[PDB]
């Protein structure tokens, strides 16, 4: 996250950290995710497309730090890895960039509710907040695009939703953004999501709840002017999610 504040999982108790193992001895962070229900985490397909070997990923819940432990964390394995079929990566965009991971702990259970582990709400069919709404994003991604390492402490920031009309302006992203995406930016282009934040949540308040409105998907640079962050529009994938829950 560029800008933002450092935080603790208690402030984002539905955030999931996904890592990959290289038996060599290291586990490296891959992307973030969000807890939908006790056994299901939702993230972005582009995070797994290149190494779709479920057996090599680990998911953690209740984690405030990237490589150190947090008391209250839960470790899980990926029982099912559902990538979207018709996922496409072009020059910038990722289409149908949503993925589901069914998790299981070494004891055989799914997540248990704690002050650091909670689920996030899903929107209703094609229901979104209106542009202007402030939403928050959270993650362990880069703090500057020139960094080659990720922060050890979790971060969060607030961004606002902008219209497609504004995001599809020729000098923003043109028609690379579709109705199945949402764009969110900082009025003063100071904070934003970046590389390492993919998969994590864009949460906004809808109908009085905190809902997962989008999934961090792509963007040109990080916190650049006229280059908003693009998120997968969860509200338009409800059927897809449902057939696998």
């Amino acid at each position: 996250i560029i800008g933002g504040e450092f935080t603790t999982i208690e402030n984002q108790p539905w955030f999931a950290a996904i890592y990959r193992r290289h038996r060599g001895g290291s586990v490296t962070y891959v992307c973030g995710g969000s807890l939908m229900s006790p056994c299901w985490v939702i993230s972005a397909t582009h995070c797994f497309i290149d190494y779709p070997k479920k057996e090599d990923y680990i998911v953690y819940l209740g984690r405030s730090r990237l490589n150190s432990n947090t008391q209250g964390e839960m470790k899980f394995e990926v029982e099912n890895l559902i990538l979207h079929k018709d996922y496409s990566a072009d020059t910038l965009a990722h289409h149908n960039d949503i993925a589901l991971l069914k998790i299981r702990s070494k004891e055989g259970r799914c997540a248990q509710p704690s002050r650091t582990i909670q689920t996030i709400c899903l929107p209703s069919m094609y229901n979104d907040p209106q542009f202007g709404t402030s939403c928050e994003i959270t993650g362990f991604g880069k703090e500057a695009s020139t960094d080659y390492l990720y922060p050890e402490q979790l971060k969060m920031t607030v961004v606002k939703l902008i219209s497609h009309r504004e995001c599809q302006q020729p000098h923003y992203y043109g028609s690379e953004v579709t109705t199945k995406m949402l764009c969110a930016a900082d009025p003063q282009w100071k904070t934003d999501s970046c590389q390492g934040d993919s998969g994590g949540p864009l949460v906004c308040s809808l109908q009085g709840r905190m809902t997962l409105t989008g999934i961090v998907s792509w963007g040109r640079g990080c916190a650049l002017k006229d280059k908003p962050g693009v998120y997968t529009r969860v509200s338009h994938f409800l059927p897809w999610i449902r057939s696998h829950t």
Partner: peptide
């Protein structure tokens, strides 16, 4: 105990 999506406290 049980989940309540969206609730932080």
């Amino acid at each position: 105990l049980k989940f309540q999506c969206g609730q932080k406290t």
